[PDB]
Amino acid sequence: ATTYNAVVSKSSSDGKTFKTIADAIASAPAGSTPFVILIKNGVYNERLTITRNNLHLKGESRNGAVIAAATAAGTLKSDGSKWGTAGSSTITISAKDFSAQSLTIRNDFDFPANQAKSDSDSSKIKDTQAVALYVTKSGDRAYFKDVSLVGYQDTLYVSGGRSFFSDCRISGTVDFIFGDGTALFNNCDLVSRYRADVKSGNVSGYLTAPSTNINQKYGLVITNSRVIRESDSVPAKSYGLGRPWHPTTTFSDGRYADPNAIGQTVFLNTSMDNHIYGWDKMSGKDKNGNTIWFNPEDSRFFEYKSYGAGATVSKDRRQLTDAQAAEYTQSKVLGDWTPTLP
Numbered sequence: 001a002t003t004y005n006a007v008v009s010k011s012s013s014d015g016k017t018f019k020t021i022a023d024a025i026a027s028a029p030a031g032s033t034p035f036v037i038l039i040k041n042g043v044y045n046e047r048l049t050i051t052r053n054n055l056h057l058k059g060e061s062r063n064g065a066v067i068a069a070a071t072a073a074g075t076l077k078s079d080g081s082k083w084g085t086a087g088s089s090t091i092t093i094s095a096k097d098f099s100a101q102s103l104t105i106r107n108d109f110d111f112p113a114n115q116a117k118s119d120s121d122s123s124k125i126k127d128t129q130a131v132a133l134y135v136t137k138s139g140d141r142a143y144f145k146d147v148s149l150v151g152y153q154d155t156l157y158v159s160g161g162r163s164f165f166s167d168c169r170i171s172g173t174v175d176f177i178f179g180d181g182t183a184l185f186n187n188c189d190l191v192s193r194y195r196a197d198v199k200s201g202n203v204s205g206y207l208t209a210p211s212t213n214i215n216q217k218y219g220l221v222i223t224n225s226r227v228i229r230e231s232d233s234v235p236a237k238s239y240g241l242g243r244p245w246h247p248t249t250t251f252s253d254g255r256y257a258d259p260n261a262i263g264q265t266v267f268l269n270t271s272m273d274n275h276i277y278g279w280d281k282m283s284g285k286d287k288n289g290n291t292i293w294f295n296p297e298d299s300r301f302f303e304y305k306s307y308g309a310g311a312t313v314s315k316d317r318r319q320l321t322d323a324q325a326a327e328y329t330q331s332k333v334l335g336d337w338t339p340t341l342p
């Protein structure tokens, strides 16, 4: 039993359809009854902010139904101010019980073309984060099935509550899954991208940059997945599994890297190609304005039964026991929430 409240299409000959996804979402009655939108194949150049609870998008196909926009953190607004990382997102989820199925979400900011620009080019952006999907503190219970997320730096920003990614593709370079949310990934392809701008022997990127609060039980949990290189040109030992993001945060005594954002990333039963070297450190600014380094050994970085060429076991790559691994089931990670589609 599946029925649609609204249909989005590129064709006028399709029938009683909306031309834009934003229009279809806006047409939903105020409230929290389920609202399900079918999105027919096409590229929809739109930026969306979801504020209605119990909204559900279903694409005709992951390959063919695309929601895309090009926005970097350093892209300037009309008033001349920057969008910023949060502000750069193609899709922002600020409601509960959202789901998306069988669609692609892209940030089309051309990171490689930006980096290839001459240093004196005033159009060359320094703030190169460009978010495809952002789940905010107001999104809890967000479910993404058979979804592809496309970007380079900061592709997926998961904050606040619980999100679940299933049968997914996520691509990027630097910190491409990051934030303080409880985010579970099952049967996903995590695709590390080629960096034309990085010298041989330097780091090309980091899969994760968790900012999980120390009192929060679960951060980024990746299960039954595949950690893969985009191409053979992605060098061996060029990508970190994670580095600890301690976000600049406003406190009573100033604005500086959050000491209690001691991130968790756990990989269970996940394949890894040899582009992976292990975990890494990350820097921020402390309460005095000095550089401060946060180390992987002080963070909640673990693996369980990784395989493939990138899966070395060493003192620098901590392993869960069987008993500890049992704590990372879908049931335990997501608690009372069972992700379901309409």
Ligand SMILES: COC(=O)[C@H]1O[C@H](O[C@@H]2[C@H](O)[C@@H](O)[C@@H](O[C@@H]3[C@H](O)[C@@H](O)[C@@H](O[C@@H]4[C@H](O)[C@@H](O)[C@@H](O[C@@H]5[C@H](O)[C@@H](O)[C@@H](O[C@@H]6[C@H](O)[C@@H](O)[C@@H](O)O[C@@H]6C(=O)O)O[C@@H]5C(=O)O)O[C@@H]4C(=O)O)O[C@@H]3C(=O)O)O[C@@H]2C(=O)OC)[C@H](O)[C@@H](O)[C@H]1O
Residues within 6 Å of the ligand: 073, 084, 085, 086, 087, 128, 129, 153, 154, 174, 175, 178, 209, 245, 246, 247, 248, 249, 282, 283, 284
């Ligand atoms: C004025 O107050 C209000 O009205 C509201 O405030 C709230 O919103 C806050 C905040 O004000 C707002 O700006 C925003 O902030 C987020 C984030 O929370 C901040 O910590 C900050 O993050 C930046 C950056 O945007 C992130 O992408 C990330 O970047 C890291 C590195 O720090 C950065 O240097 C860079 O890495 C380089 C290099 O680019 C890379 O290639 C590689 O070589 O590594 C380098 C390195 O330095 O290591 O990129 C990294 C990355 O991509 O991950 O962290 C930064 C940081 O920690 O400073 O800014 C963000 C933003 O601007 O969007 O949202 C906040 C919020 O939502 O609060 C929870 C309140 O929420 C609201 O209630 C009002 O009060």
